[PDB]
Design a protein around this nucleic acid. Structure first.
Ligand code: DCP
Ligand code: CA
Ligand code: NA
Ligand code: NA
Length: 318
DNA sequence: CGGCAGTACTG
DNA sequence: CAGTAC
DNA sequence: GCCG
């Protein structure tokens, strides 16, 4: 493996990310992930400059670690970065909020609890700071999925409930659970949140609400009994016609999703959680021209329409 | 030069 | 709207 | 940061 250039680069990428330089961190993340899974430990520059996701600047960076075992840029990391990471790991606080709290003199979560002004969402995030940093065993995700299914199938036994994300990709542990709900009849999915969430609330299962939209719920749940932790839970209701694209999107991974949107763009197509469709119309779309929705009854058709072989969820774990 | 996704909340 | 998240 |  490459673990003597990546380890240095990953410290720079984190500092860029927590300081809000989202695009530079992207390029670092890609270039790093390239190094991770390369067959060979890289030897020198051409080898580098001739790599996908490694350009002149990164190439220069790559030889320093090769030539010197050190990269000078690592000596100019702001002392703020660890605190910014601490603050942005609060659900609901991002880089802008973290930088403002830092500028205001806050340095610890005790400072935040006692003096910061917090949104409803950030207060819930703070209250579950440790829990939301933990992963749950996939068997607990199954229990959470079944709790949603049981509550849903009580109002309409036709409803289909599927846990996506890292659960559907087969991982041993899961950061949170994303439950997708549809109905093959095409309509009965509409307006089920009021009853479903009221039902899950009457349990004591749902403990906090983060986002209560018309098709999307983001909140916090806890199963009964001792030794249970609070978990992040999303519930997304989609029409049956979008089910394939929604399953793909919410199964991820997020890096797999990014690669698929890029591949779709090469074919003049758009890929979202709602549809695979023909482009609107320079770059980043056009002003007029809605585009056509391509028929995607199953996940397999999205791959096919992109000219790609079907990948089971476990093989999307990029 | 400029995209690297578009949309959904929240306030 | 800006910020955050998916 | 990467890329076209
Ligand atoms: N920035 C993001 C965030 C999410 N997603 C999609 C793909 C993810 O798989 C899915 C669910 O979001 P999560 O953050 O829960 O993704 P995972 O379940 O894969 O995260 P984890 O590895 O912790 O399990 O939404 C995306 O495309 N882009
Ligand atoms: Ca998840
Ligand atoms: Na956060
Ligand atoms: Na999630």
């Amino acid at each position: 493996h490459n673990l003597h250039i990546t380890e240095k680069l990953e410290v720079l990428a984190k500092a860029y990310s927590v300081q809000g330089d989202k695009w530079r961190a992207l390029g670092y993340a890609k270039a790093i992930n390239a190094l991770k899974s390369f067959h060979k430990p890289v030897t020198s520059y051409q080898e580098a400059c001739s790599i996908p996701g490694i350009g002149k600047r990164m190439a220069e960076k790559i030889i320093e670690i090769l030539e010197s075992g050190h990269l000078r840029k690592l000596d100019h990391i702001s002392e703020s970065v660890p605190v910014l990471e601490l603050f942005s790991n609060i659900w609901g606080a991002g880089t802008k909020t973290a930088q403002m709290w830092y500028q205001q003199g806050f340095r610890s979560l005790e400072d935040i609890r006692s003096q910061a002004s917090l949104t409803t969402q950030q207060a819930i995030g703070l209250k579950h700071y440790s829990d939301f940093l933990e992963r749950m065993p996939r068997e607990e995700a199954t229990e959470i999925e079944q709790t949603v299914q049981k509550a849903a199938q009580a109002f309409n036994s036709g409803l289909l409930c599927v846990a996506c994300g890292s659960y559907r990709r087969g991982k041993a542990t899961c950061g949170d659970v994303d439950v997708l709900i549809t109905h093959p009849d095409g309509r009965s999915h509409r307006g089920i949140f009021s009853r479903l969430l009221d039902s899950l609330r009457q349990e004591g299962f749902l403990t906090d609400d983060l986002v209560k939209g018309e098709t999307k719920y983001l909140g916090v749940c806890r199963l009964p009994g001792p030794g249970r932790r609070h978990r992040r839970l999303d519930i997304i209701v989609v029409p049956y016609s979008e089910f394939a694209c929604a399953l793909l999107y919410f199964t991820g991974s997020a890096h797999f999703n990014r690669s698929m949107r890029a591949l779709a763009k090469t074919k003049g197509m758009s890929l979202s959680e709602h549809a695979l469709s023909t482009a609107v119309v320079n770059t980043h779309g056009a002003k007029v021209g809605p585009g056509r929705v391509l028929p995607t009854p199953t996940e397999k058709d999205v791959f096919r329409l992109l000219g790609l072989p079907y990948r089971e969820p476990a093989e999307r774990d990029w």
